Amino acid sequence: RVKRGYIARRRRKKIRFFASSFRGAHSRLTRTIAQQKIRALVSAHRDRDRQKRDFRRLWITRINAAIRERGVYYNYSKFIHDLYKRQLLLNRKILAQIAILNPNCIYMIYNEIIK
Amino acid sequence: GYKMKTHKASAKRFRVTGKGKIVRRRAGKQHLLAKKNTKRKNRLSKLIQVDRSDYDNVIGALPYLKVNR
Amino acid sequence: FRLDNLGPQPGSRKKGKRKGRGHAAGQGGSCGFGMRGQKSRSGPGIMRGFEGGQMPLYRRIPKLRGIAGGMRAGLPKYVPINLRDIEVAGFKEGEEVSLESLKAKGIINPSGRERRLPLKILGEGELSTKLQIKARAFSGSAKEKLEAAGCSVTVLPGRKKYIKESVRKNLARADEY
RNA sequence: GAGUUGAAAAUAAGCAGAGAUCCGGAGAUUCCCGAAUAGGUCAACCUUUCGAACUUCUGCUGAAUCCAUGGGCAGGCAAGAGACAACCUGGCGAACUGAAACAUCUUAGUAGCCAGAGGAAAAGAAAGCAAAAGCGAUUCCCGUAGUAGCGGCGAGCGAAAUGGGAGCAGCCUAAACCGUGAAAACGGGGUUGUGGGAGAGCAAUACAAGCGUCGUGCUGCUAGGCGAAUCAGUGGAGUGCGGAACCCUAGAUGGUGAAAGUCCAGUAGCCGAAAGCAUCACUAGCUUAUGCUCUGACCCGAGUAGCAUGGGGCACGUGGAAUCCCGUGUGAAUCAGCAAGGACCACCUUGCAAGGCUAAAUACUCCUGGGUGACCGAUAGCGAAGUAGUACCGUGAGGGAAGGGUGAAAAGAACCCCCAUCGGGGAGUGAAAUAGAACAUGAAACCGUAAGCUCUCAAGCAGUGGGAGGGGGACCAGACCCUGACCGCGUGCCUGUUGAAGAAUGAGCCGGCGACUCAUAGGCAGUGGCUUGGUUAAGGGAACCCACCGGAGCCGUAGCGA
RNA sequence: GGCCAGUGAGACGAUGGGGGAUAAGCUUCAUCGUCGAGAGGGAAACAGCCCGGAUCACCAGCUAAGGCCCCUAAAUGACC
RNA sequence: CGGUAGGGGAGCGUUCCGUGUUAGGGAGAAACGCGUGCGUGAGCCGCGUUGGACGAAGCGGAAGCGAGAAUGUCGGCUUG
């Protein structure tokens, strides 16, 4: 009742096709194709949570570098002082996006934070 | 085919009592009886239930005797 | 019903769990036997009733009494039949009660001993309908029930023992009124 | 009834419609070795007075020894030797193991070794079971029953009787008695059991059955024979598809370029044996043979049973240890008796040891002939799909591989060129030549070549998130795929540990093979079927499964106590 | 209770002690926390220390422990 | 709604079998390779100038049923 099969080769060929552009025996050699599928997926996990964290960090330092161009000592903390006292609910650090896509509009943002 | 064999060394020690519970004779009776008390010698003269641990151990080691639980 | 559309009910046939076919299946790897020991190794393993070198459960307990002596165990010598087996039966007012009546009616189904233990009628339960019993001997309370019902009661002498002629002579000498 | 001289083509000669080749029955030959056999032998050879040597049978002559015995000579189609996978019987007969050690025990009277023998063998016709009721040789199956027991009462071992089926079959011999002979024998009689037989006397005749070279009988087998019913179109080929018809007592199977009720071989059915074998039924014939009365004399298997010991085996390990068989030694009775009924005694019941032979049910496959397969498909299935127990290894015992598939048909490439070949390119065959003899689908590791992007100030389990620059096709042109300037982050996988990136283990890589499975039981859970309680086992069955029987048994109905 | 598993080598940290030399990431106990079986953040890295308990997605916001010169997110913030 | 040893529930796949001489298939089945598709995933479905004859689904059953480990093992091919 012999049971020679082919399902390991489709099982294995799917993982073989996912492991393209892995520079060498991480892209050809099955017994490393498996663990590069595995380590590639957990790399996708931690780099996804830390792409949320990392783009948060990037917008913080980008709008900090935008506000510090005034010359007078107005930090990023004081922009949030007078960004929540003057009631602006949650611009979500997308003013770090229109701070470079619309620099006159972020000058209107900050020049209305002053008043 | 192969029938299971009743373990004779425990069939001579354990017994079912109609409702289906293993009873047993207490130990320490056929040896050094003057040294004990009559209170002990009729405490150790009665047949009691076996406790649940060795009520579920020998229930599969003595298969043909109709014990529930 | 066609050959196509037949299917068992759910819960009737579970799938047998296969062991060592993946850790997502449930019992992969060591197949559900821990790490090491006699429980994981292949073979007969452990005798059931063995306490690991300790003197076991059965050896520390003294033997049951007649089984300790090798005396022949207590054995039923009759068929115990209550009157509750007789009222619930469909025996009407005119009916004989014997071995083949209780076999052919559906009360007793004796198979292992058709030859040795005849019958006995016991006391618990009532018997209002009168009958004509020619069976084997009775208890005192069942004799009170059956004679309290006004039914024909007849004991049946089964077998006659062989008495030696000097024992039959010594017993026949004892007839001194 | 039409072509043949094997695979296995070619060539040379034949043999054959007064019937070849081939098939079947019965015969003939069968060199040499091997029981091997005239003698030797280092098997397939040597020497030979050419021989079945030796044992057994028959016959003659007949030593020490008179009869004998031994020997010698001779005859003999002449009985045995040797081989045989498994089952069977008989004898020697373990140990690893289990008991969580180990000696009693178990494994186990199993394996192995030797001997023997048949399709079966052993056993087998009551000196038996049983229990006051009864059965009637042995064997096997279901059951009792994992019960009674046995056992460092440990591990374990484990009946038997009652019951239900398969299959049935019972017969010869010794003794007492007559007759012949110095016994030893021979011929008649008798072989049985709620007793017979011998001795004496009275009756009485034929019913039934058993055995069997011999040949007419029957069916079956070993060769075979007749045997129904369609074309056309389709991309190589049609049996598939679409259109038109038919057979069926035949639609099982195998093949045919491709899958077939109608193409072939066949099948269903009907037939057929000179010769041999087998099945039961005839036959010249041999045989079995009968009943009563009296009679305790005479007989009913002797170095035997029993006993004292030493044991073995019955499930029973020496225990109260019976039954059965042996070693040493003692050593009975005949029926008014003896043996058994689990020490033993008394009574009763049962049977008649010390003499043999028997078919069936039954177990197995080196096989043979049919039919099958939720069996395999070239690492599988037999070790073996070719030289397979082969090549090869070992002195030897012994160990032991691997290698399948071009096409439908070799139609296997005429001829030209390179050229010493091997090979290659045209051409030709083919549906396919990228199906070319390393030849069918051809995947991964591995080795390459071409195209796009990109690396030579760079530290990295080689990824991933973001994405500079660039390339490609595009249609939902914002999308998709490929490359990757640079930044952040990220201590291979398994095993297994308190703790593994670990400098603990494992793996060179790729692909296959490779592990909680099977039988029978106990327990529980889930789904059912009946609850006029449930359910059958063995066994019977249109080959198997199966409808339907088959109530034996099992479980639950009553417990307590040793 | 029924059926049915593993586990029975623990480790460190605080307290209570014994052995030691109040020496050990030492040994043995008693209560507790973590790891084991726990990811993330802080601890430069780093099982057991602090915050904290990961179903998953978001190029969302507010915080705990801890930090706000640069590498590296946020104060070269204010006053003693 | 983290999870090791472990326990339970629900499913995918493979070859064979019933339906099955099934639907479909030299107008290209299985294979092998492919995806701008769908799933929690095991996987399904679809496309192939490769290949050439078998064989789905659904409703069910049975396993020599699923591979990355055994200094596994058998072939092929590397490194040096």
Looking at the partner chain, which of B12, B29, B54 has a beta carbon nearest the beta carbon of C57? B54
Residues 6+ apart with CB under 8 A from B15: B22, B23, B24, B47, C64
Residues β-bridged to residue C81: C121
Question: Residues before each break in chain A (C–N > 2.5 Å)?
Answer: none
Instruction: Choose the mutation target among B50, B57, B59, B65 for the interface with C, i.e. most C CBs under 10 Å.
Output: B57
Tell me the technique behind this structure.
cryo-EM
Residue B18 in contact with partner chain C when CB distance is under 8 A: no
Q: Are C62 and B30 within 8 A, CB to CB?
A: yes
Q: State how far the Cα of A72 lies from the Cα of C83, in Å rounded to an integer.
A: 113
**Chains B vs A: touching, with 3+ CB pairs under 8 Å?**
no
Q: Is the dihedral of CA A2, C16, B65, B53 positive or negative?
A: positive
Q: State how far the Cα of A93 lies from the Cα of A80, in Å rounded to an integer.
A: 11
- The pair of three-digit structure tokens given for residue A63, joined into one six-digit string: 């709008």
- For A24, left (φ over 0), alpha (ψ -120 to 50), or beta? left
Instruction: Choose the mutation target among B4, B15, B47, B54 for the interface with C, i.e. most C CBs under 10 Å.
Output: B54
Q: What single letter denotes the amino acid at residue C57?
A: L
Q: What is the DSSP string of A49-63?
A: HHHHHHHHHHHHHHH
Q: State how far the Cα of A51 lies from the Cα of A45, in Å rounded to an integer.
A: 10
Give the per-residue SS3 of chain C: CCCCCCCCCCCCCCCCCCCCCCCCCCCCCCCCCCCCCCCCCCCCCCCCCCEECECCCCCCCCCCHHHHHCCCCCCCCCCEECCHHHHCCCCCCCCEECHHHHHHHCCCCCCCCCCCCCCEECCCCCCCCCCEECCCCECHHHHHHHHHCCCEECCCCCCCCCCCHHHHHHHHHCCCC
Helices in chain A by DSSP H: which ranges? 7-18, 30-67, 76-84, 98-101, 103-114
Nucleotide nearest to C2 (CA to C1'): F19
**Chains C vs A: touching, with 3+ CB pairs under 8 Å?**
no
Name the nearest CA neighbour of C108 among C82, C127, C77. Answer: C82
DSSP state of A69: G
- The pair of three-digit structure tokens given for residue B57, joined into one six-digit string: 């151990």
Pairing of strands B22-25, C80-81: unpaired
Q: State how far the Cα of C72 lies from the Cα of C68, in Å rounded to an integer.
A: 10
Q: State how far the Cα of C59 lies from the Cα of C171, in Å rounded to an integer.
A: 49
Q: State how far the Cα of B47 lies from the Cα of C63, in Å rounded to an integer.
A: 12
Please give the residue range of the domain that contains residue A106: 1-115
Q: Are B57 and C59 within 8 A, CB to CB?
A: no
Helix (H, G, I), strand (E, B) or coil at B47: strand
Provide the Cα torsion A100, A101, A105, A107; round to 10°: 10
Q: What single letter denotes the amino acid at residue A35?
A: Q
Task: List C-alpha distances in Å: C47 to A4, B28, C44.
Answer: 39, 26, 8
- The pair of three-digit structure tokens given for residue C154, joined into one six-digit string: 């007849």
Domain count across chain A? 1
Q: What single letter denotes the amino acid at residue B19?
A: K
Residue C67 in contact with partner chain B when CB distance is under 8 A: yes
User: Stated in angstroms, how far is C58 CA from D201 C1'?
Assistant: 82
Helix (H, G, I), strand (E, B) or coil at A19: coil
Phi, psi angles (nearest 5°) of residue B14: -120, 160
Contact B16, B67 (CB under 8 A): yes
Name the nearest CA neighbour of B27 among B38, B13, B16, B17. Answer: B13
**Other chains touching A, judged by 3 or more CB pairs under 8 Å:** none
Contact B14, B58 (CB under 8 A): yes
Q: Are B27 and C49 within 8 A, CB to CB?
A: no
Q: State how far the Cα of C79 lies from the Cα of C169, in Å rounded to an integer.
A: 35
Containing B54, the helix (H) or strand (E) segment is helix B53-56
Looking at the partner chain, which of B27, B58, B61 has a beta carbon nearest the beta carbon of C60? B27
Phi, psi angles (nearest 5°) of residue A55: -75, -25
Looking at the partner chain, which of B9, B25, B26 has a beta carbon nearest the beta carbon of C64? B25
Helix (H, G, I), strand (E, B) or coil at B21: coil
Task: List C-alpha distances in Å: C18 to C15, C31, C134.
Answer: 9, 9, 63
Name the nearest CA neighbour of C95 among C70, C67, C121, C130. Answer: C130
Taking the CA of residue C16 and the nearest CA in chain B, the distance in Å comes to: 23
Which residues in chain B touch residue C69, judged by CB atoms under 8 angstroms apart? none
Q: State how far the Cα of C62 lies from the Cα of C71, in Å rounded to an integer.
A: 16
Q: At what angle do helices A30-67 and A103-114 cross, to 10 degrees?
A: 50
Greatest distance between any 2 Cα atoms in chain A: 87
Contact B28, B37 (CB under 8 A): no
